[PDB]
């Protein structure tokens, strides 16, 4: 049919061509016999017949007169549905400016006539004049005249020269302007000029001029001459109860516009006075502006009771417009809605449809079979038969519902597992029974939530539901390869009570002949389920090429584990049930079952596990009483110790040892330590408190306490929630994020005070407000992640590249958070990895390394595998299958034609939403750390210190004066096993390269109060710090000691803003000491809020604290406070104090001094040396006058902006930085996301590439054009002898990278619809319908999955 959607400006001739008439009366239906007026907003003559195939007057009434035009009233008889396809127009008496091209920034009229917006805005609204055709006087072609200046120019220059006001003058300016001459003059001026602001303005105007001249648009088309009207059926008037009519907004705006236009037309014929007609023209302009985009001007007009009526733009933009409400998501037929119940008798591919709901959903399907079987002859007889619900209708429903899967969707469809297909099982009731395994995927409990049923109609839809959306084919999460149909909170309790042992039984010493004997003994009551017997079990193994070889042995097991072994499919080792199964254990069991056996045994195993978990949880009576929450007998002693410590802290604070920002931190730390000690005490009193005889004397065992059972099994609970029941509740967190100063010292087994409950209510209301008020800014994150990566699909199989990112285990402060296996599993490597039998290859180059290859790599203990990444792929408009990796939902390579950019966006975007809607499950607990102060190396090995600038201590030890140092522990072999980030000013008890015993301290420091320790010795002079101006000082006259706190930029005076307080270290003779190895004096700056306990002119040593800086780092550290960071990383926001990197490598030296800010010159050894950098006086420089630097090295210190990294250290460095930062943020909350998704989002952030030089190509000098087009053009030119065009990659945030795409439809439907459509209309863009949102809006198959083959056929067809 069509293949493109073109948007451009509408000429008045084209507007008249659209129109089938001219509306010229402000009269709707006459509030009478419901007929349209003569030439009003509704008209049979203009738009179309009101009734189908009936003339308005009453002369033609049937299809036998089709196509003719009446004579009594002149309305052609046709289908009545042409009232929504035939537009009209309004002939404006005076020209009117389009508000979209005036008040959308930047104003097209503003930078087309080179005038400021204020001047043209005063001209349009008849408040000043503009000089068109100045002539032979002192008036330019764009000068602004007021009324007095206009009168002066009239009295003393009353020649043929004219100066008009209003939209007519602006239209004359636009029509009288030549575009090519102006463009070449601007090119001349741009080539002449040198200032960057003037260059940018001139090239922006040049771009606007080129867009105007290339397209068919004209400048004078932005001033409206004829105003088209919407067809009446798109602005209907629905009659209510009575003689009144509905309150339509578009009709009201049209009536206002028509009233103003008719009044102006009448005044233009009677020769009204000038002021009256000008005021009427201004009113017409305001009415048209209110019709086009209401509210963009000063005051939005309101219809009734002070609410602004929606214009033609308010119903196309926003969340409630034709883009996000009726095109990207619609209401559908064959759909239903009801609450859900469990029905645990089901299977993984089944659900329960109510018997009275499936009859109404599958109603046309019942009609078809009733007509086929002959029980009815027409459709009305079958309709009445179904309405009556006869005995034969239910058999027809059973026949038509047999293998017709339906889609069950829960209301927040966060990830793709929120929609799944089940084969219906008809039930009597009104609730949709849902299988208990998919409740984790749906995140659906059964406390009053409803799910929607959808009926796939076509054969293709049914097969997509059966082969793709089926709940059987959805056993792995698409975010990470972990299974998603995991038994939860009752099956795990059953399998934990079953597979467990106590040291006694009804029969314990007996030895059994198999699992059937164990089940028979348990059922007959001759043996407890927790015996310790010896069963003879025949386990199979497929260690050969798929052959199950039996190996019968006699293992020391329990009765429960032997009974459970009857459901484990053949092929799995027995050492997966011979233990106390929790939730992680059986999740691992299902995962290994899928990875070894396949999909069908895994599904059958999941069903059998659910059945035998429910059965043996019912058979146990695992209740919960009030005596199960055993209070420890030593909690109040820990309370007393902590309250004594807090009293000492208060006495230290009031004396003046610490300020009020450090008392907070230390009291939080001491109470959090006391809370953890109480939790440990109660956990030790709970887990092991089972003294039971071994049939002889007393023995110890893991407890059978119900609270501890369902806490240790992972059923429902944790250390926090269980701790709050029998330990102490702890301390709460406010909605702002601040932690409560005072803790609660009671649990939910004793009471709570009338005041402790009030304190707890702060955290409780924080938890409930956080969800409902801050899941909005996490649903926004996933929406603008989807809209930036929607058009990314797998389009190839292998691009053939040797590039790729480097993967290493992430050890950044503790043990191995993620080993190499978790980071490299299921991703195609990029080069033959070399084992430490070097010069021999371990794996080939293009092998998708699965679990066997991961085991092989871990056997040889590899530490770095260069793996292929999405961001480094060489495909155009998509990715290849090898550069992505594994599907992560199935155990194979990703299929060609799969929408991976939407799976990536959902996977990144809904741990945040889900965990910010679940912040109240811990109540309002602080959940903060204990602010660890020292480094205790647990393992054995040597130490390697990275990027350290340390000096000596007064005791001889080492003190760290570097910001980004890392204490990493290397074992005797040579591999890194432990790593720690040591902070500035931290003392070292040991050094580098020396073997440390396992379990002793190495680095000690204060968690708060970071110091400013020096490196040299001498006297210190209080330079540039005077009382009152830059420091707040208070003196104890008794001691004679001063303690001054330097103010921040807030309370510091404006005059003293250029004063920089600092401490110059000086020797005895007034000479400036030197930093060793350099010639720069030891000048050390002091930032704000810093306290100094030293006096002016006191001898010091090397490496001692001169001043202290409080940290005030207080937060609850949930996923709510902690996910503006992901938004900042994905939007690529520059931090406050960027770390200064080296733009070009070479020798570093300084030139001129104090250009307001310091000057640094980098000179290479061979090439050109034109680079100078303006370094502000704020931060010191880590490089000196005689060092060697490379590009990407840090001249200064601070947070790295993810643009310098891109432009200096390359694409791999910036993508690794973003991946690591987002992964750290998510892993802090326990979230597990594979890095393919973050790499995909980074790749979608990397699509623009600014040209450096045009070369032999057709690109411009500094144009920002898509990187794929640049690569295609350069690869095409390099095929011949021509030279390509050099470029530079750009990093745009997820908002800008989605708003600056080549398709204006996606950008318009995402955000800023007015601003996107204005630019598209001016530039005359032509959409190609290439993405997924575009085809969803249009109404086609997405080029993503099963429609990918069809789209390839269609593309290669033409």
């Amino acid at each position: 049919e069509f293949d493109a959607i073109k948007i451009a400006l509408a000429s008045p001739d084209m507007i008249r061509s659209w129109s089938f008439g001219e509306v010229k009366k402000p009269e709707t239906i006459n509030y009478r016999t419901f007929k349209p007026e003569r030439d009003g907003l509704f008209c049979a003559r203009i738009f179309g017949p009101v009734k189908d195939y009936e003339c308005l007057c009453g002369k033609y009434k049937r299809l036998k007169h089709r196509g003719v035009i009446c004579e009594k009233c002149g309305v052609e008889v046709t289908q009545t549905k042409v009232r929504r396809e035939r537009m009209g127009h309004i002939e404006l008496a005076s020209p009117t400016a389009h508000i979209w091209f005036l008040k959308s920034l930047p104003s097209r009229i503003g930078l087309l006539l080179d005038m400021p917006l204020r001047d043209i805005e005063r001209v349009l609204y008849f408040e000043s004049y503009v000089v068109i055709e100045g002539g032979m006087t002192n008036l330019e072609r764009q000068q602004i005249l007021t009324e007095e200046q206009y009168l002066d120019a009239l009295e003393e220059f009353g020649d043929e020269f004219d100066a008009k006001m209003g939209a007519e003058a602006i239209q004359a300016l636009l029509k009288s302007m030549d575009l090519e001459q102006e463009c070449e003059q601007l090119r001349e001026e741009l080539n002449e000029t040198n200032s960057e602001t003037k260059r940018k303005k001139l090239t922006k105007r040049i771009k606007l001029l080129e867009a105007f001249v290339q397209s068919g648009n004209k400048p004078e088309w932005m001033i409206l001459t004829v105003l088209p009207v919407l067809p009446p059926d798109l602005r209907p008037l629905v009659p209510l109860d009575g003689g009144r009519f509905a309150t339509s907004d578009l009709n009201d705006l049209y009536r206002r516009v028509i009233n103003r236009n008719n009044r102006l037309k009448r005044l233009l014929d009677l020769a009204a006075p000038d002021i009256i007609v000008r005021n009427e023209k201004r009113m017409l302009q305001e009415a048209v502006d209110a019709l086009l985009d209401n509210g963009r001007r000063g005051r939005a007009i309101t219809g009734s009771n002070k609410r602004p009526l929606k214009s033609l733009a308010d119903m196309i933009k926003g969340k409630q417009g034709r883009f996000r409400q009726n095109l990207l998501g619609k209401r559908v037929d064959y759909s239903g809605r009801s609450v859900i119940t469990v029905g645990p008798y089901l299977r993984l591919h089944q659900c329960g449809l109510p018997k009275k709901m499936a009859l109404e959903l599958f109603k046309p399907f019942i009609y078809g079979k009733l007509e086929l079987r002959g029980l009815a002859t027409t459709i009305k007889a079958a309709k009445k038969m179904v309405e009556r619900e006869e005995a034969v209708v239910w058999d027809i429903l059973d026949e038509v519902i047999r293998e017709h899967p339906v889609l069950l969707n829960r209301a927040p469809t966060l990830h793709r597992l929120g929609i799944q297909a089940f084969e219906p099982v008809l039930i009597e009731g009104k609730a949709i029974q849902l299988h208990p395994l998919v409740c984790a995927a749906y995140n659906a409990d059964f406390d009053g939530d409803q799910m929607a049923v959808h009926v796939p109609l076509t054969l293709e839809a049914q097969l997509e539901a059966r082969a793709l959306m089926m709940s059987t084919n959805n056993i792995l999460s698409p975010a990470n390869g972990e299974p998603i149909i995991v038994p939860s909170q009752d099956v795990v309790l059953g399998l934990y009570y079953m597979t467990r042992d106590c040291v006694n039984a009804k029969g314990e010493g007996m030895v059994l002949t198999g699992p059937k004997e164990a089940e028979r003994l348990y059922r007959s009551g001759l043996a407890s389920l927790h015996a310790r017997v010896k069963v003879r079990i025949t386990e199979y193994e497929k260690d050969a090429n798929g052959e199950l070889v039996a190996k019968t042995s006699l293992k020391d097991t329990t009765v429960g584990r032997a009974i459970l072994w009857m459901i484990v499919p053949k092929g799995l080792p027995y050492s997966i049930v011979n233990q106390a199964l929790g939730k992680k254990a059986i999740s691992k069991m299902l995962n290994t079952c899928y990875r070894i056996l396949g999909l069908k045994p895994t599904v059958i195993f999941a069903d059998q596990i659910m059945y035998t978990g429910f059965a043996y949880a019912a058979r146990s009576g695992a209740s919960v009483g009030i005596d199960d929450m055993v209070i420890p007998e030593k909690k109040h002693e820990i309370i007393s110790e902590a309250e004594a410590e807090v009293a000492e802290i208060q006495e230290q604070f009031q004396s003046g040892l610490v300020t009020a920002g450090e008392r907070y931190n230390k009291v939080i730390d001491i109470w959090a330590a006391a809370n953890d000690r109480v939790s440990k005490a109660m956990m030790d009193n709970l887990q092991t408190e089972t003294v039971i005889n071994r049939d002889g004397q007393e023995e110890k065992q893991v407890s059978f306490n119900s609270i501890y059972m369902m806490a240790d099994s992972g059923a429902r609970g944790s250390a926090a929630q269980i701790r709050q029941l029998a330990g102490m509740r702890g301390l709460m967190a406010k909605p702002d994020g601040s932690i409560i100063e005072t803790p609660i010292t009671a649990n939910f087994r004793e009471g709570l005070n009338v005041l402790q409950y009030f304190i707890s209510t702060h955290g409780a209301r924080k938890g409930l407000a956080d969800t409902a008020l801050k899941t909005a800014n996490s649903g926004y994150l996933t929406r603008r992640l989807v809209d930036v990566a929607q058009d990314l699909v797998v389009t190839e199989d292998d691009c053939g590249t040797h590039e790729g990112i480097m993967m290493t285990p992430v050890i950044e402060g503790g043990d191995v958070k993620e080993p190499l296996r978790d980071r490299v599993l299921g991703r195609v490597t990029a080069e033959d990895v070399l084992k430490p039998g070097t010069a021999d290859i371990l794996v080939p180059r293009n092998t998708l390394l699965h679990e066997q290859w991961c085991d092989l790599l871990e056997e040889n203990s590899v530490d770095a595998v260069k793996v292929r990444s999405v961001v480094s792929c060489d495909t155009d408009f998509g990715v290849c299958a090898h550069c992505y990796g594994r599907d992560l939902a199935r155990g194979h390579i990703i299929n060609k034609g799969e929408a991976i950019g939407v799976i990536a966006a959902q996977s990144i975007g809904e741990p945040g939403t889900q965990l910010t809607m679940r912040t109240f499950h811990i109540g309002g607990a602080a959940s903060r750390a204990a602010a660890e102060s020292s480094i205790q190396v647990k393992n054995k090995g040597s130490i390697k210190l990275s990027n350290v600038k340390s000096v000596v201590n007064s005791s001889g030890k080492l003190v760290i004066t570097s910001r980004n140092t890392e204490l990493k522990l290397i074992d005797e072999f040579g591999r890194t096993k432990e790593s720690y980030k040591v902070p500035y000013g931290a003392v070292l008890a040991k050094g580098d390269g020396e073997q440390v015993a396992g379990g002793e301290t190495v680095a000690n420091w204060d968690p708060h109060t970071m110091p400013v320790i020096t490196e040299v010795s001498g006297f210190v002079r209080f330079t540039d710090m005077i009382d009152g101006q830059t420091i707040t000082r208070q003196t104890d006259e008794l001691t004679g000691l001063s303690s001054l706190v330097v103010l921040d930029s807030a309370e510091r005076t404006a005059g003293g803003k250029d004063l920089r307080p600092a401490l110059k270290i000086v020797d005895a003779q007034g000479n400036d000491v030197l930093i060793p190895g350099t010639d720069m004096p030891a000048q050390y700056f002091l930032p704000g809020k810093a306290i100094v306990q030293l006096e002016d002119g006191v001898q010091i040593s090397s490496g001692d604290t001169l001043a202290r800086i409080p940290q005030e780092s207080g937060g609850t550290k949930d996923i709510t406070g902690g996910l503006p960071r992901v938004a900042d990383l994905f939007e690529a926001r520059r931090p406050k104090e960027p770390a200064i990197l080296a733009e070009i490598s070479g020798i570093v030296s300084f030139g001129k001094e104090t250009k307001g800010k310091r000057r640094l010159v980098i000179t290479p050894v061979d090439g050109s040396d034109p680079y100078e950098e303006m370094i502000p006086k704020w931060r010191q420089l880590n490089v000196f006058e005689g060092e060697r630097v490379e590009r990407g090295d840090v001249i200064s210190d601070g947070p790295e902006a993810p643009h310098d990294i891109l432009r200096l250290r390359g694409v791999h460095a910036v993508t690794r930085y973003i991946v690591n930062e987002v992964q750290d943020v998510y892993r802090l909350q326990g979230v597990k996301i594979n890095d393919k998704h973050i790499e995909v989002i980074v790749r979608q952030m990397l699509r623009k590439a600014t040209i450096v030089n045009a070369g032999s190509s057709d690109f411009l000098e500094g144009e920002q054009v898509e990187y794929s087009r640049v690569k295609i053009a350069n690869r095409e030119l390099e095929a011949n002898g021509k030279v390509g065009a050099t470029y530079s990659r750009d990093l745009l945030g997820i908002t800008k990278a989605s708003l600056a795409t080549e398709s204006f439809i996606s950008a318009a439907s995402f955000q800023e619809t007015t601003r996107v459509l204005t630019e598209a209309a001016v530039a005359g863009k032509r959409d190609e319908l290439r993405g997924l949102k575009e085809n969803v809006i249009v109404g086609r198959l997405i080029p993503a999955g099963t429609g990918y083959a069809y789209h390839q056929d269609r593309m290669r067809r033409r």
């Binding site: 939910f748 087994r749 009471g751 709570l752 005070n753 009338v754 409950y757 009030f758 707890s760 209510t761 409780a764 209301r765 938890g767 409930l768 109240f920 109540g923 309002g924």
Partner: protein, 49 residues
């Protein structure tokens, strides 16, 4: 000796809806809120009990 006032009763901090929950001092306050709302939502049965 320093005090000069005292609360009338333990019920004066909670409302008329949250004061119908027995053992309120043992519930988490989120569960107290949900209990108050659900107690507001109850429909009268056939025979009052």
């Amino acid at each position: 000796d320093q005090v000069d006032y005292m609360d009338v009763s333990t019920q004066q901090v909670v409302s008329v809806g949250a004061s119908l929950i027995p053992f309120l001092e043992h519930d988490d306050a989120n569960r107290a809120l949900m209990g108050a709302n659900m107690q507001r939502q109850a429909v009268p049965t056939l025979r009052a009990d």
